[PDB]
Amino acid sequence: EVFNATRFASVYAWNRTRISNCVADYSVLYNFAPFFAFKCYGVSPTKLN
Amino acid sequence: DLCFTNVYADSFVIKGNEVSQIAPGQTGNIADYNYKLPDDFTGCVIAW
Ligand SMILES: *[C@@H]1O[C@H](CO)[C@@H](O[C@@H]2O[C@H](CO)[C@@H](O)[C@H](O)[C@@H]2O)[C@H](O)[C@H]1NC(C)=O
Ligand SMILES: *[C@@H]1O[C@H](CO)[C@@H](O)[C@H](O)[C@H]1NC(C)=O
């Protein structure tokens, strides 16, 4: 629902949402976007689950 | 100015972004299930 959205707000008023109490499997974000930049800093995307 | 023991040439035609996908310690649909480079890769990639 956060990558299926249609009206990602502008940078001047960025929309922030909270995710909790669920199972995070990032294959969905991997296959939901033709990725151009995945520069993670705190945690490597590879073993992220 | 170098001497190499053995030299390997792996050839494959791919998309454009996957060229940047090809690098040691990377990830992607091609980098994870099609062609993963060694972490200590001693060599390089040529893309034209
Ligand atoms: C940021 O984008 C979110 C996309 O899911 C919005 O969450 C939804 O908001 C609707 C109301 O607009 C809720 O009914 C729904 O349950 C869900 O929480 C979120 O509102 C939005 N935030 C801003 C500030 O635009
Ligand atoms: C959600 O994503 C799918 C595929 O990317 C797309 O067809 C659909 O229109 C999207 N939904 C919304 C509400 O944009």
Resolution in A: 3.8
Residue pair B28/B16 in contact (Cβ under 8 Å)? The answer is no
Q: How far apart are CA B28 and CA A36, in angstroms?
A: 11
DSSP assignment, residue B25?
A: T
Q: Which experimental technique did the depositors report for determining this structure?
A: cryo-EM
Q: What are phi and psi of B31, to 5 degrees?
A: -70, -20
All residues of chain A having their beta carbon less than 8 Å from the beta carbon of residue B28 are 35
Give B27 to chain A, closest Cα distance, Å: 7
Q: How far apart are CA B48 and CA B44, in angstroms?
A: 14
Q: Which two tokens stand for residue B9?
A: 């040439």
**B19 in contact with A, Cβ within 8 Å:** no
Q: How far apart are CA B18 and CA B29, in angstroms?
A: 9
Nearest to B27 among A34, A36, A46 (CB): A46
Helix (H, G, I), strand (E, B) or coil at A11: helix
